[PDB]
Every structure is written in structure tokens, then in C-alpha cells.
A = this chain, B = another copy of it.
Amino acid sequence: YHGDSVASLGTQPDLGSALYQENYKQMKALVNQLHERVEHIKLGGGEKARALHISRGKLLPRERIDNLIDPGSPFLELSQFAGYQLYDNEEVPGGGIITGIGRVSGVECMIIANDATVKGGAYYPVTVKKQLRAQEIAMQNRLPCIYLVDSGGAYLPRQADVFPDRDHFGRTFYNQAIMSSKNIAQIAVVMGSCTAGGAYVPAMADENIIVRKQGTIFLAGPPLVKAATGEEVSAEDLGGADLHCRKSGVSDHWALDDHHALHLTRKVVRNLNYQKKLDVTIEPSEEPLFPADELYGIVGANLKRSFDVREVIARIVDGSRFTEFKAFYGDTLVTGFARIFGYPVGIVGNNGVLFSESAKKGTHFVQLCCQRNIPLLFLQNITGFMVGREYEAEGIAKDGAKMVAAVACAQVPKITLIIGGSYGAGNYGMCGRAYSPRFLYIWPNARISVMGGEQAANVLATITKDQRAREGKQFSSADEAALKEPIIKKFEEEGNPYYSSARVWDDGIIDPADTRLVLGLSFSAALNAPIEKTDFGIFRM
């Protein structure tokens, strides 16, 4: 009997209240800023580069992605802000690469396309990190990988940050080989001239598609060949579609132009013989009972004020139906069961400072979810220590670790969304980036750092004064003030959401109004892989 009436979460906010108006204004300003910056990034490498790229007859990378995916299907771009002001004077819109998840021939696939307009497709360190993150996502979710290869190889300056280390360029080929061995299809479309690094990608791919004239695969370019051995040869002769298709045999398909290559890619994906099957139960999808745009007023942009996470939950779950678990024990943490687009999910949100009871409750809920094979969703809003200096945090250590372990050992799909501050060990406890969530997103008003700037400033001043006192050097009172002002500024700049998004941490920033859609797409993508059994370590106590 599924009729059973059930109470629904959420309440109607007071629109007339001045606090709601101010929060809405601040959030709207932040969202407008984000939208305009994303537009500028989407503009591309530049006008002259785009003109040259079009003159060569090629398609712009976004046009390639639009033509590749199924008509009208949504596209979930990842890390749109990678490289945003990362380097002092060089502009790298989007990191020089485009990654996302879309549906090709009815199959969800991960797409990686190089933007030839940005430095001729050269690989910056951030580009390598972004590509590695996309490959890791695809491997974890068992998604086929499609590469639209048009690159000039590694950026010759800054080679030390791209070539040598484990998470450097070679990890790309390593991941390609591993995923091929694990029956995850690899498809490479050589849409333009590659290089030594670019050449290896089509070789390791299961299927290759190379354009007749623009596509050129050479293990070493003409300039590189001349530098290495003093040999002169034309680009087409050294590497070309006809040569690779007919004599060398590297190419697997021959394409007349970009549109033909995309059509061939769609056909190849069609002939994959893959069917998606779900393990979790499904129910009809229902929309939430409250508008999503009220989240602007509810949350605002000031981290000092506190908001009930139950409102956020009620505005993003199917029908605003929530089954709270252990409501009155450790009330600073909110846990319960809900469904997003018919998918069962276990929601773990922050409502205040973490205590021993909250940690135990979270551990219990995580164990339940792992036992029942239910995906987990974390909403992080860790609180500053302005309210409580210490609160005998030693008690928290004994129990915080229980949650950190339980979260780490979980094998169910985990998605983390940072709606507010995320500091200290609370970030680790609530499925931080280091604990391998399937996806991680942040709202435009989030702040992340080891501790708040004010708290950090006080700690540094005290340590220096005590050490100086043992040394016998007087520590000036004015010096303590002098140290504090720069530290506060540095922490604020570093904690910015754009600072974290420029580095490949925290994937991309998302408008709060689109949280439900983003979560639905992410869970639908992550459900491709089967859910394995979970093995836990030794729970202390």
C-alpha cells in the first residue's frame, strides 16, 4: 500500500521581511556575477584565434560538443572556471579544455575536447589536472570516454609541472589503458593536428576517427623532427588522414570533415552493445512543493547568520518529503531519507557545530545507508569558532574520527555540495574532496580553508609571543596587530569560491536555483556503475 499520506517538509518564508530582501539581493548579485564571468569564459580563446580556427574550416569546440550529443539533451559541463586567474599574465579560458557528461545515442558518456584557440591547444598544468579529473570520474562511473583531440602537446615552459610526476601527463595514458582493460570504451576523434603527446591518445584508443585534411597524427611534428634529427617533411606527409588510414593503419575511420566525424562517432557509440541497468528501486518523480528561487533569500551571502538546512532539503527533494532519522539526538546534524527524481538518497546536512552526538548519529546513518545500498548526499555548512573557542574539542576528536572512517570506507555513490563554510576537520568528516566523492559542487557564497582568517590570526600571534618569551625577546603588542591584518586578507582571497574553482578542486560553481537539476543529472550519471559491498575498518568503541 503506497497510498499512505506523509507529512511534507518546508515552510513558506516571509517575503516582506527585510532580512529576506537583503539576502535575496546579495545572492542575486553573486549569481549575476557568476553568469557574466561564465559568459566571458565561454567566449573562448580570442577573436583572432577564433577567426583563424574558422578559416581553417574546423568547428569551434562548443559547436562540436553541441553536434555530438543527442538533440536537446542537457550537457553537464565540469570545472568551467579552471585556470581563472591561476597564472599571473596568461589567460586560459576554461583551462584550455572542455569536459562534461552528455548523452550520445542514448548512452551517457564523458566528453573531453581540446580548445585549439587557447595557446594552440597546449597543455597547461591545470589542463592536465582537469583532464585527469574527468578521466577519474569516467572510470569511477564506468562512462565511455570520447576525446576530441586538437592539441599542441605540453606547454614547453612550465614543463616541470606537466611531464614528470605521477599525476602529470603520463597518467592520462595510464588511465586510458586501464579503462580500456576494464571494458570502458575509449573513442578518439582526431579533429586537428596533434603532437607527440597528442599522437599517443589515438593510438591507445579502441576506435579512431581522423579528419581527411585537418587531422594529422605525427609522433613528432615537423619542427620537432627537424630539431631532433634535422629532417624536413611536410605535416600532411609526416602525418595525415590518408596515410594513417591506408599505410600506417593507425586510423580506424576516415572522415571528410567535422560533421562527418561527429556522425561517425555517434554511429560508433551506437555499436557499443551496452545497456544501462539500475540496482536501486525507482519511484515516479514529483517536483518539490516550494520554488527554488526562494533559496536566495533563505541563504543569503553572509556566513555569520545561520539558516535551517531543512529549507534547502525541502526545496530540492521530490515532493518535499523527508524522513528524519534521530531528529532529537545531535540536532546540529540533519540526516534522513528522501528521493530525487525517483532515486533514493540519504541526506546528511550541517545545522551547527559538530559534537560527539552528531558524529555518532552520522556514523549510524552512514552504516545504515551502506548496508541498504543507498546513495549519500552531503550538504556542508561548517561553523566558525567565534561562538566557541575550544568547548573541550578533545571529546570531539574521539568521535569525529569515527565519522571520518565511516565516510571513507563507504562504497555507495557519494555526492558533496558545499552550501556554506567548510573548515578544519569538518571538511574531512562531511566527505571532503580528499575522500573521493563522485561529484563535488559549491554555491557562489561558499568559503573553504583550514580555519577562519580571524581565528588563524590569533593563533599565529600567540605562538610567536610565547616562543619569543622563552627566547627572552619581547614580542611587541603592535607587532601582533601588524601580523593580523595581512593574514585576514590572505585567508579571504584564498577562501574565495573562484580561488578554489580555478584549481580543479570543487569541480564547478552552480547556481542554487539549478541545484536539483545538477544533483539529478549527477546521480543519473553515477548510477551507471553497480554498487559494491562496503567493508569497514575497526570502529573504535
A197 touches B165 (CB 8 A): no
Q: Please name all residues of chain B whose beta carbon is closer than 8 Å to the beta carbon of A199 when the two chains form the complex.
A: 394, 397-398, 401
Per-residue 0/1 for A459-501: is the Cβ within 8 Å of any B Cβ (1 yes, 0 no)? 1101100100000000000000000000100000010000110
A245 touches B171 (CB 8 A): no
The answer to whether the Cβ of A529 comes within 8 Å of any Cβ in the partner chain is no
A455 touches B249 (CB 8 A): no
Chain A interface residue bracket vs B = 35 or more
Q: Please name all residues of chain B whose beta carbon is closer than 8 Å to the beta carbon of A266 when the two chains form the complex.
A: 4
The answer to whether the Cβ of A360 comes within 8 Å of any Cβ in the partner chain is yes
Question: Which B residue sits closest to A394, measured CB to CB?
Answer: B239
The answer to whether the Cβ of A45 comes within 8 Å of any Cβ in the partner chain is no
Per-residue 0/1 for A47-85: is the Cβ within 8 Å of any B Cβ (1 yes, 0 no)? 000000000000000000000001101000000000000
Q: Please name all residues of chain B whose beta carbon is closer than 8 Å to the beta carbon of A18 when the two chains form the complex.
A: none
B436 touches A233 (CB 8 A): no
Interface residues of A in 432-480 (CB under 8 A from B): 432-436, 448-450, 455-456, 458-460, 462-463, 466
Which residue in B223, B254, B459, B541 is a CB contact (below 8 Å) of A463? B223
Per-residue 0/1 for A385-414: is the Cβ within 8 Å of any B Cβ (1 yes, 0 no)? 101110111111110111011001100000
- With A4-B263, A197-B393, A217-B397 already in contact, 14 other A-B pairs whose C-beta atoms are closer than 8 Å: A2-B106, A4-B267, A159-B449, A164-B448, A164-B500, A174-B408, A180-B537, A196-B425, A218-B392, A226-B458, A231-B388, A243-B394, A250-B395, A253-B325
Minimal beta-carbon separation of A361 from chain B (angstroms): 7
The answer to whether the Cβ of A41 comes within 8 Å of any Cβ in the partner chain is no
With A1-B106, A173-B404 as contacts: A538 and B273 at CB distance below 8 Å? no
Pick out which of these stretches binds chain B: A285-293, A302-310, A366-374, A513-521.
Answer: A366-374
Minimal beta-carbon separation of A200 from chain B (angstroms): 5
B273 touches A374 (CB 8 A): yes
Minimal beta-carbon separation of A416 from chain B (angstroms): 12
Question: Which of A203, A250, A272, A392: most chain B Cβ within 10 A?
Answer: A392
Which residue in B169, B173, B271 is a CB contact (below 8 Å) of A337? B271
